[PDB]
mmCIF file of C-alpha atoms and ligand atoms in Angstrom:
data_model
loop_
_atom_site.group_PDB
_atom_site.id
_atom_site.type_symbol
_atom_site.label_atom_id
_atom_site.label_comp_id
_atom_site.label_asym_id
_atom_site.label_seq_id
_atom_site.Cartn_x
_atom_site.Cartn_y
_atom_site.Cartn_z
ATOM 1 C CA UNK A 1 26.970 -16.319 -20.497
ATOM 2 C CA UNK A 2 23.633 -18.241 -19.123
ATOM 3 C CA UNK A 3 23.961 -19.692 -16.530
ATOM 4 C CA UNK A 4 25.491 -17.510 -14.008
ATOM 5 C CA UNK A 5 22.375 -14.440 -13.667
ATOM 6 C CA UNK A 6 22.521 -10.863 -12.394
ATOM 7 C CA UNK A 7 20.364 -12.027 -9.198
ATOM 8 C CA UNK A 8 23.134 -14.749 -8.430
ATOM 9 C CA UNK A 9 26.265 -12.012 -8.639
ATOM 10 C CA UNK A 10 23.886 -9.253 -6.878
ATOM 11 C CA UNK A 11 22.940 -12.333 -4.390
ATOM 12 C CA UNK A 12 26.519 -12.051 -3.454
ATOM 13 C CA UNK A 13 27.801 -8.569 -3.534
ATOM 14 C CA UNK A 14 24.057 -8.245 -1.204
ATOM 15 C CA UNK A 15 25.041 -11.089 1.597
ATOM 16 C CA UNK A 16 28.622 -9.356 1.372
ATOM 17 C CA UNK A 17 27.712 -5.644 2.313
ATOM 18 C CA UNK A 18 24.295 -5.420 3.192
ATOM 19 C CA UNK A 19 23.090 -3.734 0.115
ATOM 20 C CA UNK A 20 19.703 -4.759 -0.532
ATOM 21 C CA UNK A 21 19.551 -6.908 -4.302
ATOM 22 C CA UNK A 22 16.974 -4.701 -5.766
ATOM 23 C CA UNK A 23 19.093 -1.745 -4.682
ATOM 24 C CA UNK A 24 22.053 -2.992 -6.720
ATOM 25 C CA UNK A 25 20.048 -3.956 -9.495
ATOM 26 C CA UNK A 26 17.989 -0.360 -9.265
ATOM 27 C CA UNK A 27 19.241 0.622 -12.910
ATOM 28 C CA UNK A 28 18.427 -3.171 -15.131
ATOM 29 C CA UNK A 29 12.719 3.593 -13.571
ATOM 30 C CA UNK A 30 9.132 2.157 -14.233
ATOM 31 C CA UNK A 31 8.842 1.968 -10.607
ATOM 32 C CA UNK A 32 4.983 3.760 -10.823
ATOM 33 C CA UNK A 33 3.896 0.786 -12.873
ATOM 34 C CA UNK A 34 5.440 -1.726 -10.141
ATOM 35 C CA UNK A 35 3.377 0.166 -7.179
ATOM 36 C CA UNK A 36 0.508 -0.215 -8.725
ATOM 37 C CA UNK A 37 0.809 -3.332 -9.502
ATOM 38 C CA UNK A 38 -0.182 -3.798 -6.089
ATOM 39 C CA UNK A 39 -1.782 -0.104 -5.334
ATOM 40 C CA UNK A 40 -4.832 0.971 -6.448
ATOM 41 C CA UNK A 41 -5.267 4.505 -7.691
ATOM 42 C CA UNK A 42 -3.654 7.104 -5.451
ATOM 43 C CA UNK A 43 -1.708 8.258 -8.966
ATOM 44 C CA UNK A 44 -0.645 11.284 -6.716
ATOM 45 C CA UNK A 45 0.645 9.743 -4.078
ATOM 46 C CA UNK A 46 2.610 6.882 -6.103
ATOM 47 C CA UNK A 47 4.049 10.081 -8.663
ATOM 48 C CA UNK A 48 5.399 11.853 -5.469
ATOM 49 C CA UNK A 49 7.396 8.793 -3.773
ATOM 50 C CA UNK A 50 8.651 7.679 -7.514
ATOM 51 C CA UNK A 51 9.695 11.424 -8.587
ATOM 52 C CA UNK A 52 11.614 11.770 -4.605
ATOM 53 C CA UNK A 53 13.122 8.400 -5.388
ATOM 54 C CA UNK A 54 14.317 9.539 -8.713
ATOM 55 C CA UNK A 55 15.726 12.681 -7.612
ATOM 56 C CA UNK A 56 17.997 11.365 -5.191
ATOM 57 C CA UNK A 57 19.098 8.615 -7.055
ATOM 58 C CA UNK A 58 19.909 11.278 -9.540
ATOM 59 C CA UNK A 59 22.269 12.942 -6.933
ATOM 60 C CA UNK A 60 19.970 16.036 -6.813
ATOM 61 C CA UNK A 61 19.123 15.684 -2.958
ATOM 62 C CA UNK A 62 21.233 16.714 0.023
ATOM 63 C CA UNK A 63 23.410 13.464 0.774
ATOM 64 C CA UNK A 64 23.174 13.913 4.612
ATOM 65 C CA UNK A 65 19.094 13.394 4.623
ATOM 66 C CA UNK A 66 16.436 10.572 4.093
ATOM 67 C CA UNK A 67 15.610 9.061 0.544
ATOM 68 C CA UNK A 68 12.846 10.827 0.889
ATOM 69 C CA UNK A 69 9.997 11.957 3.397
ATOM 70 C CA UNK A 70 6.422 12.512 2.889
ATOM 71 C CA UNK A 71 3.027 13.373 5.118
ATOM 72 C CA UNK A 72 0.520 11.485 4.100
ATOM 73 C CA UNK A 73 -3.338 12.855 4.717
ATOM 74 C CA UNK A 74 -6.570 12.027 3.649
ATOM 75 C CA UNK A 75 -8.784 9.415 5.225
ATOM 76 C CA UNK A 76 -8.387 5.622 6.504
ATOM 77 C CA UNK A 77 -7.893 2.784 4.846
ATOM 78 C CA UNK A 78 -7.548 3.502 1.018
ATOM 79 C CA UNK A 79 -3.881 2.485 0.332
ATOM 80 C CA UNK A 80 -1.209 4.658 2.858
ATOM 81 C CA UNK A 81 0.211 1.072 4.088
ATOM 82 C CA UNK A 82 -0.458 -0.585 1.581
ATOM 83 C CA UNK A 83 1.862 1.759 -0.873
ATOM 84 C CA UNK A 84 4.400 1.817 2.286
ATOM 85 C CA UNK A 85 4.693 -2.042 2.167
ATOM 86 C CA UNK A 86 4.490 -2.141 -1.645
ATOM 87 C CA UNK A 87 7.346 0.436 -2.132
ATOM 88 C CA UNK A 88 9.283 -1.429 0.686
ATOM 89 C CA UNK A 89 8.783 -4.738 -0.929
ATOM 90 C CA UNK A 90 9.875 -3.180 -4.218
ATOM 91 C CA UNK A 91 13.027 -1.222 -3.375
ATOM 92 C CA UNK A 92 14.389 -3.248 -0.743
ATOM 93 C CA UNK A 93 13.432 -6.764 -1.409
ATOM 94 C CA UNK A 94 10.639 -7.576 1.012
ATOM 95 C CA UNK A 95 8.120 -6.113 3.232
ATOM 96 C CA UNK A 96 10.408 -7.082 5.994
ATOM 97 C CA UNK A 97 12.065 -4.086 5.519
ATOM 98 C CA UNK A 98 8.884 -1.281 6.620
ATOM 99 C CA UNK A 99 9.169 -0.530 10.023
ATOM 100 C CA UNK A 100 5.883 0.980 11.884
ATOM 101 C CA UNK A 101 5.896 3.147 14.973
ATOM 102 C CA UNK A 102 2.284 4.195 16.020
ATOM 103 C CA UNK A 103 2.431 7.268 17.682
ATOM 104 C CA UNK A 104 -0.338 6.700 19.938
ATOM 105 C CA UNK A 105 1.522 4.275 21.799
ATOM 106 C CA UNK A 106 4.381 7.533 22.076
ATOM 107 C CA UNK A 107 1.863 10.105 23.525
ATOM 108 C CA UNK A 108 3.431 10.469 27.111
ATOM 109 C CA UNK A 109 6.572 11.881 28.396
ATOM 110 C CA UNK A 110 8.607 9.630 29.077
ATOM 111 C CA UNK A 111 8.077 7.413 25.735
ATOM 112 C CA UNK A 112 11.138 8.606 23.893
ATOM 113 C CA UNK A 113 13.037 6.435 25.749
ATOM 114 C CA UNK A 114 11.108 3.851 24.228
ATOM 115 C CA UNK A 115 11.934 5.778 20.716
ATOM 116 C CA UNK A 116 15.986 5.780 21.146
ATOM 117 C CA UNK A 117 16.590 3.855 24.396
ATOM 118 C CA UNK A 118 16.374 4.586 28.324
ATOM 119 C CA UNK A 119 18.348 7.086 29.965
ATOM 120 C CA UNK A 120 21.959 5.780 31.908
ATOM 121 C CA UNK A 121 19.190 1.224 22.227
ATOM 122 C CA UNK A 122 15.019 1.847 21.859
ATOM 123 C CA UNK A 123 12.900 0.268 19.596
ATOM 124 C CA UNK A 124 13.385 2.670 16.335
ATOM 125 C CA UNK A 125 17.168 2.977 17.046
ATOM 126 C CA UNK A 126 17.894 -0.680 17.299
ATOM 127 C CA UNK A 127 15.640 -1.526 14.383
ATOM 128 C CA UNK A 128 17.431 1.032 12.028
ATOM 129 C CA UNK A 129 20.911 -0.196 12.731
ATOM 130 C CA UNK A 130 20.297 -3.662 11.582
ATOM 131 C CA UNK A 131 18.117 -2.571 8.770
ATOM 132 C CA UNK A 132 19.714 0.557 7.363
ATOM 133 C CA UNK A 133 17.742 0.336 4.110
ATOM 134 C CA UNK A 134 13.767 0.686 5.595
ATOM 135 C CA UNK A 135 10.699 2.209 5.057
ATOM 136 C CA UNK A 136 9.560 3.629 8.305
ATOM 137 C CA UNK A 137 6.309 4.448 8.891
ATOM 138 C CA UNK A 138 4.877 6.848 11.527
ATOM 139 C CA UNK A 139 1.297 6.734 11.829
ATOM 140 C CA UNK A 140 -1.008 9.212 13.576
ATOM 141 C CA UNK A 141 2.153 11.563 13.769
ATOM 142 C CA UNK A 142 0.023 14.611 15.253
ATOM 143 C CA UNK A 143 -0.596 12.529 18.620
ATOM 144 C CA UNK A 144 2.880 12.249 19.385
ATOM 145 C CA UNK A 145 4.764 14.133 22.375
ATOM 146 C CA UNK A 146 6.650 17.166 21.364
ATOM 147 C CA UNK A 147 9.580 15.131 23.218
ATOM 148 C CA UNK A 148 9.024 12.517 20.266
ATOM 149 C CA UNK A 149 8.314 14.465 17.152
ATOM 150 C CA UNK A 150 12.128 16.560 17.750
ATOM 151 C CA UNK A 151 13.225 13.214 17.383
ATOM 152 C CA UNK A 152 11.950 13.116 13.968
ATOM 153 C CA UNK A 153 13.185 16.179 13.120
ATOM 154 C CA UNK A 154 16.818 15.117 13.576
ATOM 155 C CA UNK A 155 16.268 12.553 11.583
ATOM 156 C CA UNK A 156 14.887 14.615 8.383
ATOM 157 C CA UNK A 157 17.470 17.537 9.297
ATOM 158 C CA UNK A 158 20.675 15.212 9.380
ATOM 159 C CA UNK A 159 19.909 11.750 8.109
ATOM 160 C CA UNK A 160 20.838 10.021 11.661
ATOM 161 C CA UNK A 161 20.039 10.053 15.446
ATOM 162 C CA UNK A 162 22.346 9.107 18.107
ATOM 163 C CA UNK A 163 20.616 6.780 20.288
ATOM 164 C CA UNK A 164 20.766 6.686 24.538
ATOM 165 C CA UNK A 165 24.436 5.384 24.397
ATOM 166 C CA UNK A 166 26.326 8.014 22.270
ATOM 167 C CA UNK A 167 26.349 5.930 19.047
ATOM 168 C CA UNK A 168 25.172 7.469 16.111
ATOM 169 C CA UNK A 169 22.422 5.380 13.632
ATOM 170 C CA UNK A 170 22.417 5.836 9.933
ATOM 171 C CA UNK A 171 19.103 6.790 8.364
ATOM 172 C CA UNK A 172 20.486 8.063 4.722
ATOM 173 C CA UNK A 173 19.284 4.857 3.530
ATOM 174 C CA UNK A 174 15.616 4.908 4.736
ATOM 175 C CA UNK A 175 12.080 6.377 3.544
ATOM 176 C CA UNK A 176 9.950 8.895 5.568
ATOM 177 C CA UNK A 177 6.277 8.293 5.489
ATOM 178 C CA UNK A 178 4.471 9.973 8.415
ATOM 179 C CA UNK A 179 0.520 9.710 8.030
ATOM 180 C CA UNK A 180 -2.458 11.305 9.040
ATOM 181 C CA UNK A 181 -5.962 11.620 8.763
ATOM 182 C CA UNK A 182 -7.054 14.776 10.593
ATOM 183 C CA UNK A 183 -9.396 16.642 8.630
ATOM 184 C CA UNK A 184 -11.055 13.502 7.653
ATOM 185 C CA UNK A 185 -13.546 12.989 10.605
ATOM 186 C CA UNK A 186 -14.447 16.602 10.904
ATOM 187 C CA UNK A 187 -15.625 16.548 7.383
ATOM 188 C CA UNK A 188 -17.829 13.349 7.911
ATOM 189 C CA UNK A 189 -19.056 15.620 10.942
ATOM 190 C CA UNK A 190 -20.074 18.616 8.794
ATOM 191 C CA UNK A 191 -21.721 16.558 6.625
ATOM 192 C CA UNK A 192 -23.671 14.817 9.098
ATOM 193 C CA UNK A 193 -24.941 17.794 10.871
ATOM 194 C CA UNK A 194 -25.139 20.149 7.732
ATOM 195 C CA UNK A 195 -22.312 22.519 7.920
ATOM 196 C CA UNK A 196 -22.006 24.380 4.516
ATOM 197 C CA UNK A 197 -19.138 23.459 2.097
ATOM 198 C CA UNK A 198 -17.675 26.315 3.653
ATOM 199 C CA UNK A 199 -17.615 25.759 7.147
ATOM 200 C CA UNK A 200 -15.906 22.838 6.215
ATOM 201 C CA UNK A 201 -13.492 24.034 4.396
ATOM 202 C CA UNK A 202 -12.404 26.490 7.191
ATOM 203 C CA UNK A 203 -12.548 23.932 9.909
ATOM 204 C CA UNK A 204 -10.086 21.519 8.164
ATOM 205 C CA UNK A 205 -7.867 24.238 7.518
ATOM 206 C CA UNK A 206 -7.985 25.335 11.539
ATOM 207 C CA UNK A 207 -7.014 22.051 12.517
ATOM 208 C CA UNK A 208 -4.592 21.695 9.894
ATOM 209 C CA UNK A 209 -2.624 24.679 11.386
ATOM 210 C CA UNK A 210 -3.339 23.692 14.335
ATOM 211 C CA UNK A 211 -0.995 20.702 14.709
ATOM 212 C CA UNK A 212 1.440 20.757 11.533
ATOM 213 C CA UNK A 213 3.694 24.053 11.022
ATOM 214 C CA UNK A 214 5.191 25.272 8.007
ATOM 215 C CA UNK A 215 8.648 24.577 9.777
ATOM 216 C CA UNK A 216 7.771 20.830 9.667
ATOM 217 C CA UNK A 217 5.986 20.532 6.732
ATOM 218 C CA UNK A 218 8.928 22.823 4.669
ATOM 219 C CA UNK A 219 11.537 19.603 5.618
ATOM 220 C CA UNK A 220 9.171 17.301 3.381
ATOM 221 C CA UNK A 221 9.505 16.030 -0.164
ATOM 222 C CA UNK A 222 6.195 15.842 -0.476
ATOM 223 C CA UNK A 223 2.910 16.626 1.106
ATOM 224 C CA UNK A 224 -0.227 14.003 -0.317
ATOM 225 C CA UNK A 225 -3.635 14.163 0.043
ATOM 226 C CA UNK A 226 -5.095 10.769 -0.692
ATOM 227 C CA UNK A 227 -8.497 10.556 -2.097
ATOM 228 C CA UNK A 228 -11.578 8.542 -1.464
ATOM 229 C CA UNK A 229 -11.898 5.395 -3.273
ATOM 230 C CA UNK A 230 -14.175 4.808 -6.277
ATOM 231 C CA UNK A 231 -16.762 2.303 -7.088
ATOM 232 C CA UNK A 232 -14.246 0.975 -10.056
ATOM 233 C CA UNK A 233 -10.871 1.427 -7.843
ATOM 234 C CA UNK A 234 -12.799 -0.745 -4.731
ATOM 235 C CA UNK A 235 -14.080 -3.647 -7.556
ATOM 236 C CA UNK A 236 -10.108 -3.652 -8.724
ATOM 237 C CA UNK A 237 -9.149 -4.114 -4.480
ATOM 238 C CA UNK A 238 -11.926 -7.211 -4.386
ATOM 239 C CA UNK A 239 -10.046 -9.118 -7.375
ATOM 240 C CA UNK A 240 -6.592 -8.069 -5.577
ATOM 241 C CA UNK A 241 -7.698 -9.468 -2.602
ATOM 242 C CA UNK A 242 -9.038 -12.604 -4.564
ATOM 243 C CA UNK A 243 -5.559 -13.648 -5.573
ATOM 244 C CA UNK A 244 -4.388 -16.003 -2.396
ATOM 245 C CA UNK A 245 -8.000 -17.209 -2.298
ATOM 246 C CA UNK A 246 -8.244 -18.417 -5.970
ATOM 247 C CA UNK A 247 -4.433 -19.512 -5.923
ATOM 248 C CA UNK A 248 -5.714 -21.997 -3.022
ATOM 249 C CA UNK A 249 -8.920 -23.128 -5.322
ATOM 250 C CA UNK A 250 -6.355 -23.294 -8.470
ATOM 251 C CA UNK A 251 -4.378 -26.469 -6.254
ATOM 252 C CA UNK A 252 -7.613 -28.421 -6.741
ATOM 253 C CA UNK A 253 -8.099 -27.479 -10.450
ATOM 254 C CA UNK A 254 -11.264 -25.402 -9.161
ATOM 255 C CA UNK A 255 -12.169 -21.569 -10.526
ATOM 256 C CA UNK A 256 -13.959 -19.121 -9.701
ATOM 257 C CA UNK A 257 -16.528 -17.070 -11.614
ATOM 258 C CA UNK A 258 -17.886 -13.748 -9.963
ATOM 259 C CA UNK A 259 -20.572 -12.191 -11.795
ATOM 260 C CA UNK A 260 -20.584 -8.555 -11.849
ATOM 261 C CA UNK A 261 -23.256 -8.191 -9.054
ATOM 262 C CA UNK A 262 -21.471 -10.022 -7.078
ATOM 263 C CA UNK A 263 -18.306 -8.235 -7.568
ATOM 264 C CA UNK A 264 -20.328 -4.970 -6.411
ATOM 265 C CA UNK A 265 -21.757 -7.422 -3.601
ATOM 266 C CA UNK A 266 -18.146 -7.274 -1.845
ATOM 267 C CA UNK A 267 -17.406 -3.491 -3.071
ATOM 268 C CA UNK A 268 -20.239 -2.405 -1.583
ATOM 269 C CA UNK A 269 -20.042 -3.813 2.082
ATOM 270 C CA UNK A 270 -15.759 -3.937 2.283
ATOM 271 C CA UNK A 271 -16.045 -0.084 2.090
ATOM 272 C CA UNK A 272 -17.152 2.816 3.575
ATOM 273 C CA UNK A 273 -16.280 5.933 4.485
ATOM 274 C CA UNK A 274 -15.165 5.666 7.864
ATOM 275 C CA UNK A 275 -12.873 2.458 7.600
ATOM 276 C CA UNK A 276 -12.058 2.465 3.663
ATOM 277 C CA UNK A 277 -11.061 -0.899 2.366
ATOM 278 C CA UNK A 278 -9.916 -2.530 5.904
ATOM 279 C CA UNK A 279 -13.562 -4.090 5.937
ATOM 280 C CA UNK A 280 -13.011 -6.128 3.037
ATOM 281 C CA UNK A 281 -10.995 -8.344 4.218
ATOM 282 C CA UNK A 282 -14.109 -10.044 6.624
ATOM 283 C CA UNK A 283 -16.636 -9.279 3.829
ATOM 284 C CA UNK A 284 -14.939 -11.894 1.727
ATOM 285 C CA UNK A 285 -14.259 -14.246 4.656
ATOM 286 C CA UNK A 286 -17.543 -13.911 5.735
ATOM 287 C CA UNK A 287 -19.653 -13.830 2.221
ATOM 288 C CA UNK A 288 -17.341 -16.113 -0.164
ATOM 289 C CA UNK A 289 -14.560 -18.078 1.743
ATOM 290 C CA UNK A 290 -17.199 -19.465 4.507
ATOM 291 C CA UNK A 291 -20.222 -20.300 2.024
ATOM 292 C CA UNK A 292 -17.496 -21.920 -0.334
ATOM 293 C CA UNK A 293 -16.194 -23.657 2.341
ATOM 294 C CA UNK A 294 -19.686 -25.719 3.386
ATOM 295 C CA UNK A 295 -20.318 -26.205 -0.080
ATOM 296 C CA UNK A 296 -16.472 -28.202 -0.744
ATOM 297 C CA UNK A 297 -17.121 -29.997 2.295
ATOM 298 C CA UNK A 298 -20.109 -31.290 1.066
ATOM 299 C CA UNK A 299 -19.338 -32.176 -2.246
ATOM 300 C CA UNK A 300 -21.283 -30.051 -4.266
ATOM 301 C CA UNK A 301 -18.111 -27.988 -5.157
ATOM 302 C CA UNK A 302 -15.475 -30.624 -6.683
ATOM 303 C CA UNK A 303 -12.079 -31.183 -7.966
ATOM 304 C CA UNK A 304 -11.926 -29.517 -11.446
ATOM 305 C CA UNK A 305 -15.311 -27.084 -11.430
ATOM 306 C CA UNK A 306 -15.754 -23.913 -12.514
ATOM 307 C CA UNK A 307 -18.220 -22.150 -9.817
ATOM 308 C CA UNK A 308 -20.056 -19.448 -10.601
ATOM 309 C CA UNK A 309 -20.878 -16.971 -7.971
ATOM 310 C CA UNK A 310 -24.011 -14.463 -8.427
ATOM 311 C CA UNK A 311 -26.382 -12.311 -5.711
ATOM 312 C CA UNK A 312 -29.422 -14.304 -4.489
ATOM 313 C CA UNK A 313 -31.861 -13.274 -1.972
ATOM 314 C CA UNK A 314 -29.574 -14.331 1.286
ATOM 315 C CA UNK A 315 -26.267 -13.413 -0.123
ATOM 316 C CA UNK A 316 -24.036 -14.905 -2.748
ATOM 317 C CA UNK A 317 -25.066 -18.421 -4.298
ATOM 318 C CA UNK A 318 -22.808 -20.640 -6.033
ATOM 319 C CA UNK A 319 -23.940 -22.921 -9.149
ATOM 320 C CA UNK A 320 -21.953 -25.478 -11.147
ATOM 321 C CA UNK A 321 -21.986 -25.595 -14.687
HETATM 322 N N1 ACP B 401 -5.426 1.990 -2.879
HETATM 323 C C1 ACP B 401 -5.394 0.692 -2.508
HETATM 324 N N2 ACP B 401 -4.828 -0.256 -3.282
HETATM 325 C C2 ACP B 401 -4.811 -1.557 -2.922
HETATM 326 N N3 ACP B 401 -5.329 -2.017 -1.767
HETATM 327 C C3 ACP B 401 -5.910 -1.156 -0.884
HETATM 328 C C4 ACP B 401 -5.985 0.269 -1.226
HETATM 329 N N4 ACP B 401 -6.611 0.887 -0.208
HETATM 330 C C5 ACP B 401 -6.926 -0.058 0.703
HETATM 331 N N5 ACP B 401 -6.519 -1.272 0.294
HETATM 332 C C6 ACP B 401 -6.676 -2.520 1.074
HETATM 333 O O1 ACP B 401 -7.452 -2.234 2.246
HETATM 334 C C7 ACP B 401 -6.684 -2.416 3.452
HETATM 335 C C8 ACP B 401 -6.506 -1.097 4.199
HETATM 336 O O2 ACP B 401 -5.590 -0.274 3.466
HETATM 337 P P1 ACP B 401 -4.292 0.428 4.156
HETATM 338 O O3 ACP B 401 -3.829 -0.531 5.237
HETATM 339 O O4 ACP B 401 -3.343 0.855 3.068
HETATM 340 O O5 ACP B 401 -4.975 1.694 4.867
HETATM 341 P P2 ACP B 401 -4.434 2.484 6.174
HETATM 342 O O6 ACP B 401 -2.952 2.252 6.249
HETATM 343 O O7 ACP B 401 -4.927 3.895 5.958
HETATM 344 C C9 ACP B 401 -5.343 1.798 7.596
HETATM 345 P P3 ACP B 401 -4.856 2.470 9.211
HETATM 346 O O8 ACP B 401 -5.285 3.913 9.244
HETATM 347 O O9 ACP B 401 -5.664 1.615 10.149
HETATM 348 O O10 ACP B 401 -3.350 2.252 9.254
HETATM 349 C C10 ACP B 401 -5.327 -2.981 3.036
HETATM 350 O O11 ACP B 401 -5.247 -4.364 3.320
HETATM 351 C C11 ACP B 401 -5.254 -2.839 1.536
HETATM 352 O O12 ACP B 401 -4.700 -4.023 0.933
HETATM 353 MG MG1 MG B 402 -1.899 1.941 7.963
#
């Protein structure tokens, strides 16, 4: 039978109980390839949220907890949302469905209220019980208030808070990913002022112990260290972050040719490591998207062309075949 398809019956049994669609159609797995479709190296990181996934679908995890949980460290800006959106997007239909709570906003007292609701629902609470099946992110987690990160705890100890009310809030259904990137400026530090390797080494782990116990960290699926980027990794990230632009150029039959000092043009100033990646974005505004723009609006880049982009002495140059 054609013409009736799983996503149509799915559709259905989804709008009916709340189930996302790519949760009942989990089984019809090679969920490592579908994160990086969209994630860029950090192998580690997308092995340890598949193999979590897989063992509780498996029915090898305590029923009362999360999916799965998982501390993210390493530095800034080399994939942690971007897998957290991805794998949102991938097992619950849309990106919709990651929620993010930045703990620097939660550093005070009295923001747990804001957390579960005021005293006689909050923001996470509320969120939660109309979107059962989430992602939720928690970034910076080490600046929260102790007040805030027992809150937490609940959650990974018995799959559920009760909120401000007395009503109890599912989180069985959701994914854990707290993040962090101490460790990652006090290296930069060392090597700026010339600390041996081993200095280093010990300072990381001081800080480290510091702020994350073995209590905490012993509740997690996983702990992952995400790396730096490579050269190759950040040239794969500028043709990722191509896509929407060329799918716009593609409307007026017009292409777009990077050479490949150009392509290291954009690699080379969208990363660094203090930010990662989150200065490409502008780079390619800046260097592509606005120079393309003038050059459309005046007619010297048409309907139908194929523009080839190289590294001239101001910047990128565009010539038409
Ligand atoms: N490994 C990777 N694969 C694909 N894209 C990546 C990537 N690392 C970084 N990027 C791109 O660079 C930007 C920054 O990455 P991301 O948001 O994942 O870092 P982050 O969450 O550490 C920043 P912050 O610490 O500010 O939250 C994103 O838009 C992302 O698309
Ligand atoms: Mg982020």
């Amino acid at each position: 039978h054609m013409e009736v398809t799983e996503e149509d019956i799915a559709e259905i049994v989804s709008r009916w109980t709340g189930i996302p669609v790519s949760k009942l159609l989990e089984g019809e797995l090679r969920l490592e390839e579908e994160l990086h479709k969209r994630v860029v190296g950090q192998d580690e990181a997308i092995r340890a949220v598949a193999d979590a996934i897989r063992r509780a679908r498996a029915g090898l995890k305590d029923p009362n907890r999360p999916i799965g949980s998982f501390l993210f460290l390493g530095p800034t800006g080399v994939g942690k949302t971007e897998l957290a959106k991805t794998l949102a997007a991938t097992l619950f239909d849309t990106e919709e469905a990651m929620i993010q709570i930045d703990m620097t906003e939660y550093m005070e007292k009295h923001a747990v209220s804001r957390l579960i609701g005021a005293p006689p629902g909050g923001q996470l609470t509320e969120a939660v019980r109309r979107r059962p099946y989430s992602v939720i992110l928690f970034d910076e987690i080490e600046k929260a208030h102790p007040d805030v990160f027992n809150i937490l705890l609940q959650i990974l100890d018995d799959g559920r808070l009760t909120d401000s009310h007395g009503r109890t809030v599912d989180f069985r259904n959701t994914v854990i990913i707290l993040t962090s990137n101490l460790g990652s400026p006090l290296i930069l530090e060392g090597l700026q002022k010339g600390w041996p390797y081993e200095r280093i080494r010990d300072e990381v782990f001081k800080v480290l112990q510091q702020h994350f116990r073995p209590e905490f960290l012993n509740r997690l699926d996983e702990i992952v260290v995400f790396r730096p980027l490579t050269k190759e990794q950040i040239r794969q990230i500028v043709e990722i972050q191509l896509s929407y632009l060329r799918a716009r150029l593609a409307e007026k039959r017009i292409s777009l040719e990077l050479t490949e000092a150009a392509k290291d043009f954009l690699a080379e100033r969208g990363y660094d490591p203090v930010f990662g990646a989150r200065p490409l974005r502008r780079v390619i505004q800046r260097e592509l998207e606005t120079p393309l723009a003038q050059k459309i609006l005046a007619g010297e880049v048409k309907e139908g062309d194929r523009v080839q982009v190289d590294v001239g002495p101001a910047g990128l140059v565009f010539a038409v075949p």
